[PDB]
Amino acid sequence: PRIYKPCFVCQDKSSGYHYGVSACEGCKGFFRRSIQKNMVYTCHRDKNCIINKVTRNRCQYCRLQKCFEVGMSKESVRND
Amino acid sequence: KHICAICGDRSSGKHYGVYSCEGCKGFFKRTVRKDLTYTCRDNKDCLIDKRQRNRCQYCRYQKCLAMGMKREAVQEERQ
DNA sequence: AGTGAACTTTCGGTGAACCCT
DNA sequence: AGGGTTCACCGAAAGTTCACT
Ligand SMILES: [Cl-]
Ligand SMILES: [Zn+2]
Ligand SMILES: [Zn+2]
Ligand SMILES: [Zn+2]
Ligand SMILES: [Zn+2]
């Protein structure tokens, strides 16, 4: 019944606020992983790649760039 | 039979010059003592009622003021 | 081996209940 | 009547899981 602004990263339907922004379950999980797994991606284009529900899985580098850009907090990804 | 001017829940009496619930007294006490600033996720017109009051803290705090809760009525922490 | 829908867990704000004059 | 504190509890936001390609 509760409506949230679209995922800030890919603009798909949001499950809620994840790491400071309205985010979809995909972008929440992706961000948690790139931080926990200390992933370092590379753009196999020119870094200007566009993120939306249909393309979000094509460039992991540009998807992680947008997570950061919109304001996802790396600090709130628990590390023990 | 008193009602909280802010959320509509049953009121105990006047707190910070306003008929309010025990929750709105507490939230305002916390906000003023800690000098807290909030941001509305939506368009600053969030429905503040018994159910949805904890959803947006911004709109709950702006409604406390609109219903006239005096920030000066909040004293400093005892010890 | 990565993704994401659907779960389970965490912990700090909330507030019912309690002081005091 | 209205200031002050308190701490179980609950839900938002965290982690977890597991089909599916
Ligand atoms: Cl004031
Ligand atoms: Zn997304
Ligand atoms: Zn790219
Ligand atoms: Zn209230
Ligand atoms: Zn609001």
Residues 13-72, chain B: which have Cβ within 8 Å of A?
A: 41-42
Size of interface A-B (CB pairs under 8 A): 5
* Number of domains comprising chain B: 1
d(CA A74, CA B59): 28
At what resolution in Å was this solved?
2.4
Identify the bridge partners of residue A31 per DSSP, sorted by sequence position.
none
Question: Can you give the length of chain A in residues?
Answer: 80
Helix axes A60-70, A25-36, angle to 10 degrees: 100
The H-assigned helical ranges of A6-78 are: 25-36, 60-70
d(CA B62, CA A65): 35
**Residue range(s) defining the domain that contains residue A34:** 1-80
Q: Residue A17 in 3-state DSSP? A: strand
Which residues are CB-neighbours of B11 under 8 A, at least 6 positions away? B2, B3, B4, B5, B19, B20, B21
Tell me, letter by letter, the H, E, C secondary structure of B9-77.
Answer: CEECEEECCEEECHHHHHHHHHHHHCCCCCCCCCCCCCCCCCCCCCCCHHHHHHHHHHCCCCHHHCCCC
The closest of B9, A74, A8 to B1, measured between CA atoms, is B9
* Number of domains comprising chain A: 1
* Ligand that lies nearest to the alpha carbon of residue A6, given by its number in the listed order: 2
**Is B64 assigned to a binding site?**
no
**Residue range(s) defining the domain that contains residue B6:** 1-79
Q: Please name the method used to determine this structure.
A: X-ray
d(CA B68, CA B15): 10
Nearest 5°: phi and psi at B2? Answer: -100, 145
